[PDB]
Amino acid sequence: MAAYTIVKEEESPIAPHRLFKALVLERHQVLVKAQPHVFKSGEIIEGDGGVGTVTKITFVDGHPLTYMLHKFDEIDAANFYCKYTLFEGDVLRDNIEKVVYEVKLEAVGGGSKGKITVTYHPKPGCTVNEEEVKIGEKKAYEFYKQVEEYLAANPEVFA
Amino acid sequence: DPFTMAAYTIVKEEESPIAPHRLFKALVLERHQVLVKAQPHVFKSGEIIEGDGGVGTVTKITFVDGHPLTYMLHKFDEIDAANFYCKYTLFEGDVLRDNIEKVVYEVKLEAVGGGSKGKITVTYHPKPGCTVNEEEVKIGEKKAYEFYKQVEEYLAANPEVFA
Amino acid sequence: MAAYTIVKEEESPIAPHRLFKALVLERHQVLVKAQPHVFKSGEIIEGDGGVGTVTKITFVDGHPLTYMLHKFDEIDAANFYCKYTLFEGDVLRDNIEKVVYEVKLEAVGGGSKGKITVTYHPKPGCTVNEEEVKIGEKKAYEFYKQVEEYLAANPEVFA
Amino acid sequence: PFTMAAYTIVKEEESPIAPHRLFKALVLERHQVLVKAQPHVFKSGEIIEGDGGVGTVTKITFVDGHPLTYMLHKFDEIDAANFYCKYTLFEGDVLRDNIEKVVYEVKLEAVGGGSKGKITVTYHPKPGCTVNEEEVKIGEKKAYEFYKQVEEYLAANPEVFA
Amino acid sequence: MAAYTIVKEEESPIAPHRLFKALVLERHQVLVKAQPHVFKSGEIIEGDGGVGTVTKITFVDGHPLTYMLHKFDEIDAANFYCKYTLFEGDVLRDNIEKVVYEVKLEAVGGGSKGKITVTYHPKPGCTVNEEEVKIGEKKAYEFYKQVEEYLAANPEVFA
Amino acid sequence: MAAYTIVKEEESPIAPHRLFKALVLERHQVLVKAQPHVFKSGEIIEGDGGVGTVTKITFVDGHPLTYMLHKFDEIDAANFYCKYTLFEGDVLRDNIEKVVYEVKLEAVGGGSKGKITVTYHPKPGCTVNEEEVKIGEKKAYEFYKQVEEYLAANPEVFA
Amino acid sequence: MAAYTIVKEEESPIAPHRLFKALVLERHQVLVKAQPHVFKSGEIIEGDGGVGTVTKITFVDGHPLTYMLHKFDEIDAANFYCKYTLFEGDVLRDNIEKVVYEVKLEAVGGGSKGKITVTYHPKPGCTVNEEEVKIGEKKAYEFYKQVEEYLAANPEVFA
Ligand SMILES: O=S(=O)(O)c1cccc2cccc(Nc3ccccc3)c12
Ligand SMILES: O=S(=O)(O)c1cccc2cccc(Nc3ccccc3)c12
Ligand SMILES: O=S(=O)(O)c1cccc2cccc(Nc3ccccc3)c12
Ligand SMILES: O=S(=O)(O)c1cccc2cccc(Nc3ccccc3)c12
Ligand SMILES: O=S(=O)(O)c1cccc2cccc(Nc3ccccc3)c12
Ligand SMILES: O=S(=O)(O)c1cccc2cccc(Nc3ccccc3)c12
Ligand SMILES: O=S(=O)(O)c1cccc2cccc(Nc3ccccc3)c12
Ligand SMILES: O=S(=O)(O)c1cccc2cccc(Nc3ccccc3)c12
Ligand SMILES: O=S(=O)(O)c1cccc2cccc(Nc3ccccc3)c12
Ligand SMILES: O=S(=O)(O)c1cccc2cccc(Nc3ccccc3)c12
Ligand SMILES: O=S(=O)(O)c1cccc2cccc(Nc3ccccc3)c12
Ligand SMILES: O=S(=O)(O)c1cccc2cccc(Nc3ccccc3)c12
Ligand SMILES: O=S(=O)(O)c1cccc2cccc(Nc3ccccc3)c12
Ligand SMILES: O=S(=O)(O)c1cccc2cccc(Nc3ccccc3)c12
Ligand SMILES: O=S(=O)(O)c1cccc2cccc(Nc3ccccc3)c12
Ligand SMILES: O=S(=O)(O)c1cccc2cccc(Nc3ccccc3)c12
Ligand SMILES: O=S(=O)(O)c1cccc2cccc(Nc3ccccc3)c12
Ligand SMILES: O=S(=O)(O)c1cccc2cccc(Nc3ccccc3)c12
Ligand SMILES: O=S(=O)(O)c1cccc2cccc(Nc3ccccc3)c12
Ligand SMILES: O=S(=O)(O)c1cccc2cccc(Nc3ccccc3)c12
Ligand SMILES: O=S(=O)(O)c1cccc2cccc(Nc3ccccc3)c12
Ligand SMILES: O=S(=O)(O)c1cccc2cccc(Nc3ccccc3)c12
Ligand SMILES: O=S(=O)(O)c1cccc2cccc(Nc3ccccc3)c12
Ligand SMILES: O=S(=O)(O)c1cccc2cccc(Nc3ccccc3)c12
Ligand SMILES: O=S(=O)(O)c1cccc2cccc(Nc3ccccc3)c12
Ligand SMILES: O=S(=O)(O)c1cccc2cccc(Nc3ccccc3)c12
Ligand SMILES: O=S(=O)(O)c1cccc2cccc(Nc3ccccc3)c12
Ligand SMILES: O=S(=O)(O)c1cccc2cccc(Nc3ccccc3)c12
Ligand SMILES: O=S(=O)(O)c1cccc2cccc(Nc3ccccc3)c12
């Protein structure tokens, strides 16, 4: 059970409830707001917006990837806590079974602090892509920095 | 030590939809300014005379002229703006009514959902061998809660006001 | 202290996801479509429909009553299980601190079955009689009925 | 309608005894030090819950002839390292019907081969009834005399807790 | 950047509050009781059972490895959760920066459920020895049991 | 022109007033108690023990070195700070006018943390034999460690 | 690891409530005032004009370096005592990690005298180049010399 893991910490001028709404609860929608050139649509197909909720993110028709689904494992918007899981979608490929994210945020001034952890759950006797991992933190970190900048400059959004 | 003069302490537990950073700011840091903005008929101005809006800072809160009162003097004893903590003391001004040595405000807030949780604890300190009026206490808490409640509605209404 | 406990076991032709949506998850917004001659507005004042959510139902201007705020406690919608708190509002008389409903449905063929466990808790400052505890029941029994008629005649709603 | 009162006493103190010493005697081991200093007033004292850390509770018992009989205490916050503690006298016959509980905050600091302390004690009234100086001064003088007693033995014995 | 993670779930017949005191809280001393042949000492350098506790170990002089050092990130003693990291040691080979221990137990019947995660963080540039992984599990597992049975055979131990 | 100052930070189980006394105030007398094969005598030749005080420390006979004189420039015992300086002796070779010593200690639990800064000042138109600094620290640290162990065993010395 | 230390005692007719501000508190805006050709911009991007603040001086298009960042380990704007650290920026050659500047201004009638301790601290095994010290000591003394003029020139400013 060899699972590669990236546990990191970040810090923002953006407020923590706001950033959470943007990067966790509303992520499926916000992905399409920040990258209309990559994602055609983002929805919920199962759940009411809390634990057990299932989203469907669809790439534009010209993108190599097709779609992904994530499920909400635990959510406690009270203390900016959620653990979700990417359990279906081409990006996974054949070597990976599901990618699990666990996010913890907290206010530090008018801004935030967060502990983000990614763990890749490989299929029986497969090699987790070390490269797939660099691509993972890459795609997100950009997204997170891209959102942070919209928000900074549009303070009424999710405020 | 025949006695260590007894002091009067109120411990409050309060909650807002306002995010702890907007409130730490509106009612602690820029309070001096937000009072006059919120209640421009009672206070002409608030202005930091000493320090640079940080620890050991002291402000002068000024009432109108016709108003019984004139100026209030607050000193900043402890701050951790990151964690929304503050000790700030009231010492120079006639709001005491020539009997209280000082009033000790201790404040701690924390985020919840889209809002705040709040630790407030007021302590009234008299000058040598004087009584600590229940009266002033009734009023020290009542004017501030009203104050607080006005500034909440503002910030709920105007959602970009504090940063 | 001690409280009055109404416990029940009702049965319905409507499927349980249709009732759970109509009478638990969207109750607040459904009380106004059905009793627009009583209620002006229903709304979540805070929450993601999760567990710490709070809704607000407002009575019409003339109505002797003014408002109620309900705050979910824990949910399992998939299973149609919900415990939800009536913590404040004009409706609570001085004798009542809160009223706790415990909802759990199951399927019965093309219909449903459900047990309800409504509890009136008082304030130390007063005691609980039966006239009021009997009214709550009527209000809420009569509501469902009005809704059953509706979920039966329009099968598209929350199906 | 208003927030209930409670009475606080702030003290600032200075000792020529090293501070880790007095943190052991009047705080971490108050329950055992109280009997050694005052076997005349106390029969025993001891722990009943925990192993010294946050949440730890202790029990105090006065001889069979004393008009008081026992006292309970819970440790709210311990940061021994900087000599800060917050504990609560929450149960025993010492709480005259008006008193609900007594909260004690203590911070100590090094000053040469001795120390400086700031002690704050907060009495909390129970619904309806009111607190008064009675319980307080008596409470103030009991704690102080004990400590002086501590101070004179800790000095008279350099290696004890040193 | 990427770490080797080990997620483990087993479950043992002992009340959580009893394993907890042995396999983690006092795991310094009871590690000798367990192996008075591989283990020389069990010590708590600092921490009064306080989070941020750091222990000190040393195998018998014969053993090639000198000692092991742990800090306790957090301990929910009341809740039977603990996070601890192996931060220094001869056992901590020159290619591993730290090995993190995430353990959470809870009562199940008259037994326990064991899920624990250990993460292997490699010192900058190194791949980390996949040997130290297989090894890590076997050694702290074999010891898992010893301590189970013993505690099983004495119901008065840490009651 | 610029001198060499080595900024150190250390930790002792001993209390700061103990460290400070032993390693600073009666240091001239302890060096002989701890190292009577190295040293013959410690004394004060120009001072009362207050600021601007001078000690005279002779090395046993048949020893390379002959003696050393230090002056106590700043003394704030209350906060455990000191500024003293070696300015005379064959131990200071041809180069360096004066290596300066600055000790700042703090209480912590049953012990103490320290901050020490040695500032080696080159001799008029010279370089600093940065190999005499390597030599200076060692002996001063052993002296220390010997004193540490000595004070721990006998907890009545500098109480 | 050794460090390079500067003991410089200066003088100046110009009043210290102006130099101190210029030379320390508003140095970031004034560097950029005395040498527009060396720097195009300089600002405070963190902290709030007090101990713990961080500055960003931005060298012009035509410079090897483009920016450096300073931190105020300590401020005392009434006794004219400061202690700020150069933590980040290109100027720090692989062998230098930070420079610690301790300044103290005293009042000599209508002017000042001073003591500046500049201490360059090396990274893990690396050592500072004699070069690295005279450079820093000079463009800075030079800067000071232009301001002695600037100010004296016009008592209007900083008075
Ligand atoms: O404004 S929102 O959609 O709320 C929004 C919310 C959060 C992040 C966003 C990033 C980019 C663009 C947005 N809006 C946008 C505006 C114009 C065109 C396309 C997107 C973002
Ligand atoms: O799935 S939904 O599409 O919202 C859905 C649609 C219509 C009625 C539903 C009733 C109960 C639970 C649902 N979902 C749900 C999903 C996950 C967890 C808990 C409840 C219902
Ligand atoms: O550069 S950033 O957006 O800052 C970026 C910031 C921080 C971390 C990053 C990690 C991986 C990839 C990026 N790639 C990337 C790739 C293409 C465009 C933009 C970014 C990261
Ligand atoms: O592009 S960024 O992450 O901004 C980037 C920034 C700085 C250094 C990089 C080194 C390798 C790969 C990158 N990116 C990358 C992006 C996509 C696929 C593969 C590699 C680097
Ligand atoms: O969901 S995110 O990573 O945030 C994401 C953010 C932005 C762009 C993305 C594009 C492709 C795949 C994603 N997910 C993905 C997940 C795991 C592995 C590889 C790609 C993207
Ligand atoms: O950007 S990442 O860490 O890659 C990221 C990856 C996946 C989910 C995330 C959710 C919330 C915030 C993020 N970042 C974040 C950054 C700064 C502060 C707080 C959170 C998330
Ligand atoms: O953010 S950084 O942490 O520096 C960072 C981390 C990792 C990779 C990065 C690649 C490009 C730019 C960065 N910075 C960046 C910063 C803000 C906006 C866009 C890119 C990268
Ligand atoms: O807008 S005001 O009417 O003054 C106002 C009225 C009442 C309460 C206020 C509280 C905070 C900030 C305000 N204004 C504000 C204005 C500019 C900058 C920052 C705050 C408040
Ligand atoms: O409680 S108030 O009386 O308004 C109050 C009185 C005095 C000082 C206060 C400082 C901060 C916040 C307050 N209120 C507060 C309320 C809710 C949450 C957080 C703080 C203060
Ligand atoms: O007196 S208090 O309400 O405490 C009070 C406190 C502080 C400022 C006040 C300003 C105007 C009127 C008040 N009260 C008031 C009282 C009686 C008649 C009319 C007005 C003020
Ligand atoms: O309480 S304050 O928030 O500073 C405050 C807030 C708003 C209005 C006030 C009016 C008068 C006196 C104050 N202080 C005060 C303090 C102690 C006793 C009596 C009045 C007022
Ligand atoms: O009682 S207080 O808690 O102060 C109080 C606090 C906050 C708001 C108040 C509003 C109206 C009356 C109060 N009572 C009141 C009573 C007598 C005179 C004036 C106001 C309010
Ligand atoms: O439609 S209404 O005429 O408002 C309506 C009228 C009367 C009773 C109703 C009961 C349940 C749902 C309704 N409507 C509804 C409509 C859309 C979605 C969910 C419920 C009811
Ligand atoms: O307060 S809300 O207005 O929804 C809100 C608004 C914006 C961002 C939020 C982030 C987390 C939790 C919320 N609310 C929440 C409320 C109750 C329980 C749990 C979370 C957020
Ligand atoms: O029962 S509810 O279902 O919320 C309800 C449903 C429909 C109509 C109602 C009208 C008034 C009060 C309610 N609540 C209420 C609560 C307790 C006692 C009496 C009435 C109503
Ligand atoms: O109002 S009465 O019918 O008189 C009434 C009287 C007595 C008990 C009742 C209980 C539930 C509902 C009522 N009304 C109701 C109305 C329509 C449908 C179902 C029940 C009750
Ligand atoms: O029973 S009622 O009186 O309408 C009622 C009263 C109070 C709370 C209720 C909550 C859910 C469903 C109801 N009715 C229901 C009806 C059929 C099947 C399952 C639930 C509730
Ligand atoms: O706990 S102490 O104060 O340390 C204490 C010290 C020494 C003797 C004491 C005797 C009785 C009661 C105590 N407590 C007490 C508390 C409140 C009121 C009056 C007495 C005594
Ligand atoms: O203040 S006393 O009332 O005796 C006292 C009362 C209750 C607890 C105390 C704990 C530590 C030290 C005290 N005195 C102290 C004195 C001098 C220096 C340091 C501490 C304590
Ligand atoms: O005699 S003691 O028993 O200590 C004593 C105990 C309790 C209260 C005291 C009050 C005043 C003076 C005392 N003596 C005193 C002695 C030295 C310094 C300060 C006060 C008190
Ligand atoms: O550390 S290991 O490298 O796996 C290891 C290697 C060899 C023997 C071991 C014996 C006991 C515990 C281990 N680990 C361990 C870890 C934490 C607490 C207690 C024991 C042993
Ligand atoms: O060693 S092996 O049998 O290879 C082994 C193989 C697979 C899993 C193991 C787990 C724990 C201990 C082992 N050995 C062990 C051996 C002797 C005493 C205690 C534990 C394990
Ligand atoms: O540092 S001391 O602690 O005095 C020291 C203590 C004990 C023995 C010493 C022997 C030689 C040189 C020293 N110092 C020295 C100092 C500067 C340069 C070269 C040597 C000795
Ligand atoms: O020590 S200097 O190298 O000049 C120096 C270098 C860099 C920054 C300085 C800031 C204030 C004073 C200095 N000294 C000083 C001395 C005499 C007159 C004016 C300034 C500074
Ligand atoms: O003349 S300087 O004052 O340095 C100077 C100041 C401002 C901008 C400069 C741009 C290029 C070269 C310089 N000279 C230079 C000289 C030697 C090495 C590197 C650059 C610049
Ligand atoms: O010329 S500077 O522009 O500082 C300069 C810039 C960059 C690198 C330099 C290297 C050596 C000497 C310099 N200057 C120098 C100046 C006077 C005397 C001796 C050396 C360097
Ligand atoms: O650049 S040079 O003079 O060559 C120079 C060379 C070598 C060392 C220097 C030290 C300080 C200032 C310089 N220049 C300087 C220039 C004008 C006024 C004050 C000092 C130094
Ligand atoms: O910041 S100052 O020295 O005052 C300074 C003042 C004026 C111009 C400077 C140009 C380059 C580098 C500096 N500093 C520097 C410092 C340490 C090492 C290397 C360069 C300059
Ligand atoms: O730069 S000047 O052109 O004089 C200048 C022009 C306009 C406004 C100024 C304000 C402050 C300091 C200056 N100069 C300054 C110059 C050197 C050192 C310190 C301050 C100002």
What are the beta bridge partners of residue B73? B60, B92
Nearest atom in ligand 26 to the alpha carbon of residue G64 is: 7
Cβ of G5 within 8 Å of Cβ of F119? The answer is: yes
Question: Which of chain E's residues have a Cβ under 8 Å away from the Cβ of D55?
Answer: 78
CA distance B9 to D3: 9
Whether ligand 27 lies within 6 angstroms of the CB of G141 is answered as yes
Closest-CA distance of chain D to residue B96, Å: 18
Q: DSSP letter for D26, please.
A: I
Burial label for D98, CB within 10 Å (0-12, 13-18, 19+), is: middle
Q: Which residues contact D104 (CB under 8 A, 6 or more apart)?
A: D85, D86, D87, D88, D89, D119, D120, D121, D122
CB atoms within 10 A of CB A54: 18
Checking DSSP bridges between strand D42-49 and strand B43-50, what pairing results, if any?
unpaired
* Residue B17 in tokens: 């939809």
Domain range for B101 is: 1-163
First to last CA, chain C: 42
Q: Are A59 and A41 in contact (CB under 8 A)?
A: no
Question: Which of chain D's residues have a Cβ under 8 Å away from the Cβ of E50?
Answer: 53-54, 78
Q: Which residues contact B112 (CB under 8 A, 6 or more apart)?
A: A78, A79, B15
CA distance C36 to C39: 5
User: Which residues contact ligand 9 via a Cβ below 6 A?
Assistant: B 12, 14, 16, 23, 27-28, 105, 107, 109, 116, 118, 120, 144-145, 148
Q: Are A159 and B160 in contact (CB under 8 A)?
A: yes
Q: Which secondary-structure segment (H or E) carries G142?
A: helix G130-153
Instruction: List the chains bordering chain G where 3 or more Cβ pairs fall under 8 Å.
Output: B, F
CATH number (domain holding residue B89) = 3.30.530.20
SS3 state of residue F149 = helix
Question: Which of chain D's residues have a Cβ under 8 Å away from the Cβ of B12?
Answer: 3
Q: Which residues contact B127 (CB under 8 A, 6 or more apart)?
A: B99, B100, B101
Burial label for B135, CB within 10 Å (0-12, 13-18, 19+), is: exposed
Stated in angstroms to one decimal place, the resolution of this structure is 2.3
User: Which residues contact ligand 24 via a Cβ below 6 A?
Assistant: G 8, 10, 12, 19, 23-24, 103, 114, 116, 140-141, 144
SS3 state of residue D17 = coil
Give the number of beta-carbon pairs within 8 Å between F and G. Answer: 28
Give the number of beta-carbon pairs within 8 Å between D and E. Answer: 11
CA distance E67 to E39: 9
C138 Cα: distance to centroid of ligand 16 (angstroms): 6
Residue given tokens 């029941």 in the structure block: C137
- The closest of G143, G137, G155, G111 to G39, measured between CA atoms, is G143
Domain count, chain D: 1
Q: Are B79 and B109 in contact (CB under 8 A)?
A: no
Q: Which secondary-structure segment (H or E) carries D150?
A: helix D133-156
What are the counts of helices (DSSP H) followed by strands (DSSP E) for chain A?
3, 7
CA distance G48 to G43: 11
B33 Cα: distance to centroid of ligand 8 (angstroms): 9
User: What is the number of residues in chain G?
Assistant: 159
Closest-CA distance of chain G to residue F3, Å: 5
Query: Strands across the sheet with C96-108, in order?
Result: C4-12, C111-122, C96-108, C81-89, C67-76, C54-59, C39-46
Cβ of F78 within 8 Å of Cβ of D112? The answer is: yes
Q: Are D155 and D17 in contact (CB under 8 A)?
A: yes
Q: Which secondary-structure segment (H or E) carries D134?
A: helix D133-156
Q: Which residues contact E11 (CB under 8 A, 6 or more apart)?
A: E108, E111, E112, E113, E114
* Residue E40 in tokens: 């020389």
* Residue D155 in tokens: 């000095």
